[PDB]
């Protein structure tokens, strides 16, 4: 019985990273495996194979970073279902095409306390390979008990953002990242960092 | 650093490209660029060179990509780029690197076919634009 390709095969970006997603095949048993691959620079092209995913059980792989890679073009990424003696035929992704479609994480906020003055700073855990991103961050801040909050002023990665404080309880950072190519894309908010004044 | 604008009108140039390319037969007996091209390869002096080098093959080549339809989509990207090379030219300034990969692309036009070229230099358009220049302007 010839084993039945994976369905819903997704390509995506997170947190400035590359997926391929999927579910498995329908009329498959439990405990087969799945070879991925993806296709390498438009001018040396052909489909490579993922070393970390090949024969994994999971229904998702990483694709970022990869060799032969080139995140400044279009790539598709390929699924096929395997068990020893049968593999189901190969179901390609959607083009995906990095500067364009890559979605920004949220940056981690380093946190320090002069007097008055609250500093809060972006940091970034990027892909090594990543191309050089223009990145900028936005800072909320609110008294935890009063509602209204303030949205400081598009920062770009690499500069503080300084909070002047008054002396007045638990007080609140959270930032998003903003990243523009051709169109602004938006990251959720950080996780807020609450603490005691 | 490229405006919202600009970079989609190259986009909207680079995928007119790649659709009229899927019509051609492109293959290249060795493929235009290095496989490792990188200015990171190369001195910081000699990095100017080499983008004024792939700048004027990426110009060559597109301005002579046939047809109405082409001329008209790569009529403001070829504006944007004319505009890049001139202000590279303002400031700029025995055989190795830069010597070995000017001379790859130097002789590219001359060996390899027209669809060739132009796949190579579309394929590349991206990586100039976004890696290539902004390296150039931080280490100057
Ligand atoms: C606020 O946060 C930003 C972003 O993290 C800080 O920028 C980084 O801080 C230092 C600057 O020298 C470095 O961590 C980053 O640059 C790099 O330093 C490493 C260590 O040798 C090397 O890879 C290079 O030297 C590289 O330049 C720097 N990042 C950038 C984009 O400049 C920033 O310092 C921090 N606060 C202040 C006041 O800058
Ligand atoms: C892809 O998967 C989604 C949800 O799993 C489903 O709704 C959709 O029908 C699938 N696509 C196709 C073409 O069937």
Redesign the pocket.
């Known amino acids: 019985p010839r084993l039945a390709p994976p369905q819903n095969v997704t390509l995506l970006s997170q947190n400035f990273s590359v997926y391929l997603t999927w579910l498995p095949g329908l009329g498959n048993p439990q405990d087969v495996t799945y070879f991925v691959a993806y296709q390498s620079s438009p001018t040396r092209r052909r489909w490579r194979e993922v070393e970390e995913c090949a024969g994994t059980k999971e229904l998702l792989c990483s694709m970022m970073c990869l060799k032969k890679q080139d995140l400044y073009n279009k790539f598709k990424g390929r699924v096929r279902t395997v068990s020893p003696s049968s593999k189901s035929p190969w179901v390609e992704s959607e083009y995906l095409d990095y500067l364009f479609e890559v979605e920004p994480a949220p940056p981690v906020l ?1 946190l320090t306390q002069t007097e008055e003055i609250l500093s809060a ?4 855990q990027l892909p090594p390979c990543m191309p050089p991103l223009d990145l900028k961050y936005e800072v909320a801040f609110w008294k935890e008990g009063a509602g209204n909050k303030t949205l400081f002023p598009v920062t770009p ?4 953002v300084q909070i002047t404080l008054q002396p007045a309880e638990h007080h609140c950072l959270s930032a998003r990242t903003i990243y523009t190519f051709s169109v602004p894309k938006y990251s959720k908010f950080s996780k807020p960092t609450c603490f005691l004044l | 650093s490229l405006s919202p604008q600009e970079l989609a009108s190259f986009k909207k140039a680079r995928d007119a490209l790649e659709e009229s390319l899927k019509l051609k037969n492109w293959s290249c007996s060795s493929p235009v660029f290095p496989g490792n091209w990188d200015l990171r390869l190369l001195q910081v002096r000699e990095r100017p060179v080499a983008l004024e080098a792939e700048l004027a093959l990426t110009l060559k080549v597109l301005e002579a990509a046939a047809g109405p339809a082409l001329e008209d989509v790569l009529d403001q990207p070829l504006h944007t780029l004319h505009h890049i090379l001139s202000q590279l030219q303002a400031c700029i300034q025995p055989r190795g690197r830069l010597h070995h990969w000017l001379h790859r692309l130097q002789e590219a036009p001359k060996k390899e076919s027209a669809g060739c070229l132009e796949a190579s230099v579309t394929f590349n358009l991206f990586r100039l634009l976004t890696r290539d220049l902004k390296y150039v302007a931080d280490g100057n």
Do not use: E, F
């Open positions: 380093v700073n972006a940091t970034y990665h690499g500069q503080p």
